[model samples]
Target: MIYIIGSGIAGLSAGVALRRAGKKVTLISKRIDGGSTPIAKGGVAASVGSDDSPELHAQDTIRVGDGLCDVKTVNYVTSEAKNVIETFESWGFEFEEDLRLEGGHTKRRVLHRTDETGREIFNFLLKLAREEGIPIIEDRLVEIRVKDGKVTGFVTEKRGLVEDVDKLVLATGGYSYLYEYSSTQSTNIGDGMAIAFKAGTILADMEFVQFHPTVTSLDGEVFLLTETLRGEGAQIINENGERFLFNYDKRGELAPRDILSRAIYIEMLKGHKVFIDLSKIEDFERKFPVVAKYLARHGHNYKVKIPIFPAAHFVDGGIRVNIRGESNIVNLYAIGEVSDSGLHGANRLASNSLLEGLVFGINLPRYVDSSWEGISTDDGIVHSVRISGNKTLSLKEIRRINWENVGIIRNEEKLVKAINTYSSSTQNEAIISYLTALAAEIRKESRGNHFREDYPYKDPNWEKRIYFKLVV
Candidate 1:
C-alpha cells in the first residue's frame, strides 16, 4: 500500500501510474481542490506533432531555464511529455486541437481545453480516480514518519491520527500561500513542503519564487491573467497608460516573465498601478470569452481594461527530486511544483508547469513500482503519536514574514532578519523560517521572478540548483 499526499495533478498522475502497476494507493488531502493544478488557466506544453521535436522543446526549456537547468533532466521530462499527453487523452482529457504560443516559446505546442485547461484535466483525472476506486481521504497531513532513513507513514492534523504505510509519495504543491498576494488557491499552504522539511527531506530552490507579470485585479480580488492573453496581443500599461515593456526588452510583451514582472513592479513602485489593455486585439470578445465572462461575473469589463499586478504565482525551488521523481528519502517521491525537477530553472517558462507535472507525474510511478516490490511492512510494531503543547505563531504572522522577506524582491538584510525571526521560534514558526531561509540562502543572484535589489546582476556561474534540508 502507498500513501500519496495531495490530490493535485501530480498526485492523480501517481495514483493512475501506481494503479496501473497494481499497487493499492491512498491519496490524502485537506481540501481536494486546494492544489494549484486545478486553477492553471494556460495549457500544457508538449511535443504532440512531428514538427515539434523534443529537442526543440528541450532547447526552449534550457533557454528559459537560463543556464540553471539540468540538461539531462530537461531532456528526460521533455522526451516523456508527449506520452503523458497521449495518456491523458486516452483517459478522456480533452485538449484544444489548435496550439497556443506563449512568451518564452518559439512554437505553438501548448495543449489546452480552450481556457479552463487545468480544470478540464483535473476533472478528468479526478473522475477516473473515483471510477478506479482509489482511496482518497480528505485529511490534513501534519507529519511524515521515518525510521532507519526510510519512509514509513504519516500523521494527519485532524485528531492527530497516524497511519502506517509501505511507501509514501509527497505530491504536495509549492509554498505559494505563504505570500499575502499569491495566485495560488487558498489551500496551498505549503503543507507538503512543510511535512517533507519536518521529516528531514532536503528542499531545494525555496527562494526562487516566480511571479506572474499579469494578474487581474477587480474589487480587491485577484485572479491569474493567463499568458495566453498576451499571446492574443494584450499589452501591459502603466497608470499614465504607457506600454513600458517596449522600453525594457526587444521581446516586449514576449519577454521572460521575471523581466516583464519586474518592469511592472517598478512601474507600480513609481505610483502607477499597471493595467492590461486587451482592446487593441481583434475579435477580443470572441477569442477570450472566458475572461469576458469572468469579468462580467465580477462586474468588470475586459474590453475596457483591467487592473493588473504581479504576485507570487509559482516557486521554482522545492524538494529536490531527480528525473524519476525520487527524493533523498527512501520510498518517498515528489512531483509537480513540490519537486524541483530542473525543468524550470530560476524561472519557469509560461505554460510549461502543467507539462512538467504530467511528465514527472507519470514517470514517478515506475520508480515507485521498482522499489515497492522489495518493501515489506512491519504490521506488529506499535506506533506512538503525540501532539506538542507548544505556542505557535499565528497565520497572519507567517504570511507577513513571508511576504515581507521571501517575496519577489529580497536583500541580505531582509533575508537575515526573516531567517533570524523564524529561527528564534519553534513549532509553526520554525517551519516557515526554515523554508524561507532556505529560499533566501540559495538564491544569491536575482533572476526571473526572484529579484534581489542587493544582488541584481545575473551571475553566469551561479546556475547550479541548490538543495536544503530542515534539521529539527
Candidate 2:
C-alpha cells in the first residue's frame, strides 16, 4: 500500500498514476479540494498548439527561470506535456479552446477553462480519482515515521491512528500561507514539506517564494487576480495615478513576474498605493467577465479602476527531488510545487506549474513500479506517535514571524534575526524553526522571490540550487 499526502494536483496525479500501475493507493489530505490547486486562475501552459514546439516551450521556461533551470528537467517536463494533457483530456477534463498568451512566452499556448482552470482541473481529477476506487482519507498528517533512514509511514492528527505503507509521496504544495497576503488556498500551510523536513529529507529553496505582481487588493484581503489578466493588456499604476511598470520595463505588463512584483513592492515602499488599470483596454466586460463580475460582486466598479498589490503567490523551492521524482530518502517522492525538480530555478514561468505537476506526477508512478518490487515493506510497524509537547510559542506568533521576515523581501540581518528568534521560541519550534532557519540560510543572494535588500543584485556565480535537511 502507498500513502499519498495532500490531494492537490500533484497528490491526485500521483494517485491516478499509481492506481493505473496496479498499486493500492490511499490519498490523505487535510481538506478535500481545498489545496492551492483550486485557487489557480491562470491556465496550464504547454506546446499543445500546432505552431508551438517542445523546444520552443523549453526555451521559454529556461528564459523565465533566469538561467538557473536544469536543462534536463526542463526538457523532460516539456517533452511530456502533451501526454499529460492527453491523459487529462481522457479523464474528462475540458480545457478552453481559446489559446491565450502570457508573459515571457513567444506563443499562445496557455490552455484554460474559462477563468477557473485550476478549479476545473482539480475537480476533474478528484472525480476521476474517486471513480478509480482510490481511497481518500481526509486527515492532517502530523508527522512522518522513519526508522533506519527509511520511511515507514505517517501519523495523522486522528488519535492513535498510524498508516503503514510501502511507499509515500509528499505533495503538500508550497508554504505561501506563511505570508499575510497570499494567493494560495486556505489549507496550504507547508505541512507536508515540514513533515518531510522533520523526517530527514532535504528541502530546497524554501526562501525563494514567488510574489505575484498583480493581486487584487480587495479591502486588504489579497486575492489572486491571475496573470492572464496581464496577458489581456492590464497595466499597473501607482497611488499618483501613474503607469509605472512601463517605465521599468518596455514589456510593461508583459515583464516577468519577479521584476513586476519587485517593482510594485518598491513603488509601495515609496508611499505609493499600487493599482491595476484596465480602463484603457477594449472590451473589459467581455474579455474578463469573470474578473469584472467578481469585482462587481464586491461592489467595486471594474470599468473604472482596480486596486492591486504584490502578494506571495508561489514558492520556487521545495523538497529536493531528482528528474525521476526520487527524494534523498528511499521510497519517498515529491512532485508539483512540493518538489524542487530543478525545472523552476530561481523563478517559475506563468503557467508551467500545472505542467510540472502533470509531468512529475506521471513519472513518479513509473519509477515506483519499476523499483518497489524488490523493496521490503516490513519496518516493524510503530503503532503511534504522540504530539504532547509544549513550547513557549503560539501559532499566531509563528505566523507573525514568517510574515515579518520571510515575507516579500529578505536580508541577511532579517533572515538571521528571524531564524534566531524562531529557534529560541518554545511553541512548535521544531517544525516552524526548521522551516525558518532553512529558508534563511539557503538563499545567499537576492534572486526571484528570495530578495535580500542587502544583496539586491543577482550574483552570476551564485545561481545554483540550495537544499536543506534537519540538523539533528
Candidate 3:
C-alpha cells in the first residue's frame, strides 16, 4: 500500500490516480479537509489562452523566479499544464470559460469557478476519493522508522505503528501560517518539511517566502483579496485617494506580488492607509460574489475602497526534489508546496501553485520506481522528532518573531535575532523557523520574495539554490 501524508490537492489527486490504477492507497491527514489547499482563492494557471502557449508561460515563470529556476523543470511543468485541465474536465469539473489575468503573467491564463477555486477543486477531489472508497486515516505522523536508510514505516499519534514497506509521499503543504499574520490554515506549521529534514532529506530555498499584498483584515479575521481583482481593473490607492502603486512600478497594480507587497509594507511604515479600490471593476458583485459578500458584511460595496495589507501567504521552498518528484531520500516522494521542485525558484508566479499540485500529483504514477534500492546509512537508526506542546516561548511569540524579523524586509540583525529566538525551541515549527532565518542570513541578496535591505540588490554570484540537510 502506498501511504500519502497529506489530504490536500497533491495527496488526494495522487491517491485517486493510484487507486484507479488498482494500487492500494491510504491517506493519513491530521484532518480530512485541512491545510493550505482549501483556503486558496486564486485559480490554476494554464496555457489555454487564445494568444498564449506553454513557451510564453515558461518564460514568465522563469523570469519571475529570479534566475534560480531550473529551466528544464519549468519547461516540463508548463508543457503538462493542459493535460491537468483536460483531466479535471474528464472528472466532470466545470470551470469558468473566460480566463482571469493575474500578477507576473502577460496573458490571461488562470481558470477558475468564481473566486473560491481552491475550495471547489478540493471538494471535487475529496468527493471522488470518498466515492471510490479510499480510506483516509485521521492522524499526525510523529516519527519515521528507517532501517538501512529505507522507509520501513511511520508512526502516528492516533494509529501508532503503520508498516508495510511501500512508498511514502509527503504532500504536506507550506509553513506560511508560522507568521503572526497569514492567510493560511493554522495547521500549516512546516510539519512535513521538518519531519523530512529530520529523516535526512535535503531541503532547499528555505529563505524565500511569497507574501500576498492584498489580504483584507477585519476584527482579526483575514480574507485573501484575490489578485484577479487587480487584473479586472481594480486600483490600489492610499488614504489620500491617490493611485499609489504607480509610484513603485510601471505596471501599477499588475506588478508581481513581491514588488506589490514591499510597496504596501513601505507605505504602511509611513503611516499611510493602503486600500484596493474596486469601483473601476465592472459587475463586481456578479464576477466576484465572494468578495462582494465579505464587503457587504463590513458595510462596504464596490464603490468604497476596501482596506488591504500584506501577509505571509506561501513558501517557495521545502525538501528539494527532481523533475520526477523524487527527494534525496529513497522511496520517499514529495509534491505540492512541501517539495522544492525548482519550478518556482526564488519567487512563485501567481496562480501557479494549484497548477504545480495538479500537474505533479496526476503524473506521479509514471515516476514510481519500485525496484530502486534505498540509500544506505551508517547504522540502522530510527528517527523521531520533538513535537510536544511545551516550548520555550508561546506560539504567538514564535509567530511574532517570524513576522517582525524574518518577514518581508530583512537584514543581518533581524535575521540573527530570529535564528537565536527560534533555536531555543525544540518544536518542529520552531526548528524550521530557525532554519529559515539561517538560510535568509546566508543568502545575502534581495531576490524574488526574499528581500534583504542590507544586500539591497541582486548578486550574480548568489544566483544558485541553497540546500540544507539536518546536521545532527
Candidate 4:
C-alpha cells in the first residue's frame, strides 16, 4: 500500500501522480479541509508569457535564494513551469488571463485565479483525485512503521485507522508555526520534519525560515495581509505614514520577501509600528477581495492604515529529497514544503511554492511509474498506546520559545538557550524547535532568512547548507 500523509497541494499532486501509476494510494490529513492550501491567496509563479522563459524564472529563484539554491533543481522546476500552467488550464483550472509582477521576478510571469490560486487549484485537484477512486481518509499519521530496514506500513488515529504500506509520500508542509506569530496553519507544526528526522532522514536548510513582510499586526490579533497588496502598487508605512522601506531597500514595497520582512522587523525594532497603506490601490475588491473582506471585520479602520509586521510565513528547509522527491529513507518520498528539495534555498521566491508543488507533482509519478508499485493493505490490526509524563513539553511553551529566540533573527546564545531548555521535553514541537535552534547555531553567518545578529553579514566561506540527521 502507498500511503501519502498530507492533503495540501503537494500531497494532492503526488496522489494524482502515484495513483495513475498503478499504485494503491490513500491520502490522510487531519481533516479533508486541512493545511494551508485554502488560504494561499498569492498568485503562482510561472513563465507563461511570451516575453519570459524557464531560464528567466530559474535565474530569479537562484538570485533570491542567496546562492544556497540548487541550480539544477531551479532549472528543472522553472523549465517545466509553463507546461505546469497549461496542463492545469487544460484540466479546467482557471488563472487570471493576464500576468502580474511579483518581487524577485524581472518578468511579469505570475499567474492567478484572482489571488486564491491555492484554493482554486486544490479544488480542481481534489475533484480529480475523487474521480480516480483514491481513498482519502481524514486521520493523523502517528507513526511510520518500519521492519527489516524497510517501510512496511503506517499508523493513523483520531478516527483511528492503520494501513499496511510498502512505501509512503510525505506532503506535509513546513515548521514555521513553531514561531508564536506565524501566518501558516498551526497544525503544520513539523509533522513531517520530526517524523522524518527521527526516522533518520537528512534534513537540510533548517535555519532558513521565511518571514512574510505584511501579515496584519492588528494589535491584540495577528493575521496575514497578503503581498498581493504590494503587487497591486500599494505602499507599506510606519505609524506616521512614513514609507520606511525606502531606507533599507531601493525597491521599497516591491523588494523580495526576505528583504521586505527584514525591513519591517528593523522598523519595529526601532519603535515605529508598521502597516500597509492600501489607500493608493484603486479597487480593494477585485485584486484582493479576500484580504479586503477579512480586513473589513478584523480591521477597525482602513483609513487608519492596516497595521502590519513580520511573521513566520514559510520555511526554506525540511526533510532532504532528490530532484525526483525521493528521500534517503528507502521507499519514502517528500514533496511540497516538507522536503528540502533545494529549490528555495535560503529564501523562497513569492508564489514559487505552488509552482514547485505543481512541477514536482507532475514529474513525481513518472519516477513512480518506473519503480515498483505498492499494494493494498488488509492488516486489520490495532496497537495499544499510552501517554505519561511530567517532563513532557507543552505546545504553547514550545511556540513561545521558538519565537523568542529562534525567530526571524537569531544568534548562537539564543539558539543554544532554546535547545538546552527544551532538550528533555518531547513532542513534535520540541524536536523541530531544537532542530531549528541547532541549525541556526550551526550556521554562523547571516544569509537569507536565517539572521544571526552576532554574525550580521554573509560570509563567502559559509555558503553551504547546514545539514542534520542521525544518518548523516
Candidate 5:
C-alpha cells in the first residue's frame, strides 16, 4: 500500500504518476487544495523558448546557487525542463504565447499566465487527478513508525490512528511560516523535515533560507510582488526616490534573489523605506492582471512608489534525496520543497521551485515500483527528537529573535544566542527554530541568503553541504 502526504502540486503529481503506473495510491493532506502551490506567483522556469537551452538554464542555476548545487541533479532537471513544460501543456495547461524574463535567467523563458502560475498549475493538476478518479484524503502527518531503520508506516490525524503501510511520500513543504513575514502558506512549517529528521533521514543544508526581494503590505495580509515586475522594467527606490540597488552591486536590481534581498535588507538597516517604481512598465494593468487587481483593491497605484521589503520566500535545503525520490530511510520518499534534491544549492534560482516538484514527483513512480522490493535494514535503532514545552521566553519572542538575528543577515554571535534561546524549550517551533539556527551557527561564512555581517565573505573551505541528525 502507498500513502502520500501533502497535496500541493508535487503530491498530486506523484499520486497521478503512481496511479497511472498501476499502483494503489492515496494522497493525504491536512489542507490539500491549499498551501504554497496555489498562492505562488513566479512562473516555473524552463528552456523551451527559441533563445534558450538546458545547458544555459543549468549554468544560470549553478551560478545563482553559489557553489552548492549538485551538478548531476542540476543537469538532469534542466534537461527535462522543456519536456516537463510541454507535458503540462499537453495536459490542458495554458501559458502565454511569449515568454518573459526573471531575475537570474539570461533568456526570456518563463511562461506564465499573468501572475497566477501556481494557481493555474494547481488547478489543472488537481482537476486532472479528479477526472482520472485518483483517491485523495485530507489528513495531517503526525508521526512515523520506523523499525530497524525502515519506515513501516505513519500516523495521521485522519481515522484517529496510525495507518499501516510500506511506502510513504512526504511533500509537506518548508518552514518559511516560522518567520513573521513570509510568502509561503501558513500551513507550511517544515513539519515533514522535522518528522524525517527524527526518523533518521539526513537533513541537508538547513541554513540557506531564500528571501524574496519584494513582499509588500499591499493588502491587509502581506502579498508577494512577483520578480517579473522588475523584469518588465520596474525600478526599486529608497525613501528619497533614489534607485539605491545600483549603488550596492554592479548587476543592480537584476542580480539574483539572494543578493538583491540582502541589498534591500541592508537598505532597511539604513532606516530607509525601500520602494518599487512601476511607472516605467508599459500596460501596467494589462500585462499583470493579478498584481494590478490586488493593488487596485488596496489603493496602490502605478504612479506611486510601492513600498517593499524582503520576506522569507523559499528553503534551499531539506530532507536530502538522490536523483530518485528515495530518502535514506527505507520505504520513505519526499518531493517538492520538502526534499533537498540538490538542484538549488545555497540559494534557489528564481522559479525553478515549481519545476523541481514536477520533475521529481513525476520521476518518483519509477523508483517507488522497485525501491522496497529488495530493501531491508536491521540497525535496531530508531531516532526521534523531543522538544520541552518549558521556556523562559514566549512564542512571540522566539520569532522576534529570528527577525532580529537570522532574517536576511546573520552573524556568529546572534546565531549562537538564537540557538541558546531555542535550546531552552522543546516546542515544535522552538525545535525547528533551534535546528535552523544551529545550522546557520555552524556555517560560519556568508554565502547566498545566509549573510553573516561578522564573517562577511564566502569561505572556500565551507563549500560543502551541511547535514544534521537527531538522536532520541
Candidate 6:
C-alpha cells in the first residue's frame, strides 16, 4: 500500500494517477478541503500565450529565484506546464480564456477561474479522485517509522499504527502559519517536514519564508489581499497616502512579494501604517469578487484604501527532494510546498505553486518503484512520538516569536533570539522554528526572501542552498 499523507493537489494528483496505473494508493489529510490549496486565490502559471514560450518562463523563474534555482528543475517544470494545463482541461477544468498577469512574469500566463482558482482546481481534482475509487482518509500524521533507511510505516492520530505502507509520500503543506499572521491554512504547521526530519531526510532552505505584502486583518483574522490586486493597478501606500514602494524598487507594485513585503515592513517599522489603495483598479468588484466580499465585511469598497501589512504567506523550503520528488530516505517522497525541489530557489514566483504540484504529482508515480512485502507489527515499531512537556510553547507563543524574529526582515540578533527562544521548548513545532532560525542565522547574507538587515546585501560567496539533517 502506498500512503500519501496529504489531500492537496500534489497528493491527490499523485494518488489519482497512481491508482489509474493499478497502484494501490491512499491519500490522507486532516480534511478534504484543508491546507493552503483551497485558500490560494492566485492562478496556475503556464506559458500558454502565443508570444510566450517555456524558455522565457524558465528565464523569469530563474531571474526571480536569486541565483539558487536549479536550472534543470526550472527548465523541466516550465517545459512540462503546457501538458499539465492540457491535463486539467481534459479533466473538465475550465479557466478564463485570457490569462492573468502576476509579479515576476514578463508575460500574462496565469490561468485562473475567477479568484477561486485553487478551490476550483482542488474541487475538480477531488471529484476525479472520488469517481476513480481512490481511497481518501481523514487523519493527522503523528509520526513515521523508518527501518534500514526505508519508510516502513507511519502512525496517525486517529488510526494509530498504519503499517500497510510500501511507500510514503508526504505532501503536507508549509509552515507559514507558524507566524503570528499568515494567509495559509492553520493546519499547515510543517508536520510532514518535522516527521521527515526525524526520519533523517535532509531539508533545505528552511529560512526562506515568503510574505505577502498586501494582507489585511480585521478583528484579528488575517485575509490575504492577493497580489492579483497589485497586478490590477492597485497601489500600496503609507499612512500619508503616499505610494511608497517605489522608494525601495523601481518596479513598485509590480515587484515580487519579497521586496514589497520588506518595503511594507519597513514602513510599519517607521510607525506608519501601510495600505493598499484600490481606487486605481477599475471594475474591482467584478474581477475580484472574492476580495470585494471580504472588503464589504470591513465596510471597505473599491473607492477606499484598505489597511494592509506583510504576513507569512509561503515557505520556499522543506524536505529536500530531487526532480522525481524522492527524498533521501528510500520510499519516502515529498511534493508541493512541503518539498524543497529547487523549483522555487530563494523566493517562489507568483502562481507557480499549483503548477509545481501538478507537474511533480503527475510525474512522481513513474519514478517511484516500491513493493510491499507486509512488514510485521514488531518490525514496524513506533520508534517515536510527540515531544511533550510543560515547557512546550503554545501555538500563540510560537507564532509571536517567529513573527517578531524570523519574519520578513531579519538579522543575526533577531535570529539568535528566535533560536534561543525555541531552544527551550520540547515540541516539534519549536524545533522546526529553532531550525528555521538557525538556517537564517547561518545564511548571513540577504537573498530573495531570507533578508538579513545586518548583512543587507547578497554575497557571491553564499550563492548556494542550505541543507538541514537532524542530529537524532
Residue-level error in angstroms, candidate 2, position 47 = 1.1
Tell me the whole-model lDDT of each prediction, alpha carbons only.
Answer: 0.74, 0.74, 0.84, 0.76, 0.80, 0.83
lDDT of 2 by residue, 182-252 (tens): 67765766777877877877766666677777788576544677676777777678778787887777888
Best by lDDT: 3
TM-score of 6: 0.90
State the lDDT of candidate 5 residue by residue for 339-401, as single tens digits: 888889988988899899988887777777564532111211122344555886665676678
Tell me the TM-score of model 1.
0.88
Alpha-carbon error at 315 in model 4, in Å? 0.8
What's each prediction's TM-score?
0.88, 0.87, 0.89, 0.87, 0.89, 0.90
The 10-residue segment of model 5 with minimum total lDDT is 374-383
Cα lDDT tens digits, model 3, 1-472, are: 8999999989999988878777788889997788888877779999998899999999999998998787777999999999878986897788999998876799999999866788998999999888878888889988777766667788889879888948898999999989987888887888888888878777788889889888987666679887779988899988998887889899999987777888888788688998888898988888888888888787766697888889888899897777777877878888999988889988898888899988888888876745553222221122223333345776788888998899998999999999878765768888789878988998889998999999999988887777776654
Candidate 1 minimal-lDDT segment of 10 residues: 375-384
User: What are the runs in model 5 whose C-alpha is more than 4 Å off?
Assistant: 226-256, 267-273, 279-290, 372-395
lDDT of 1 at 453: 91
Question: What residue pairs clash in candidate 3, if any at all?
Answer: none
How many clashes in each structure? 3, 4, 0, 2, 2, 0
Q: What would you estimate as the lDDT of candidate 6?
A: 0.83
Q: What's the ranking of the predictions by lDDT, best on top? A: 3, 6, 5, 4, 1, 2
How many residue pairs in model 4 have overlapping backbones? 2
lDDT, residue 49, model 2: 90
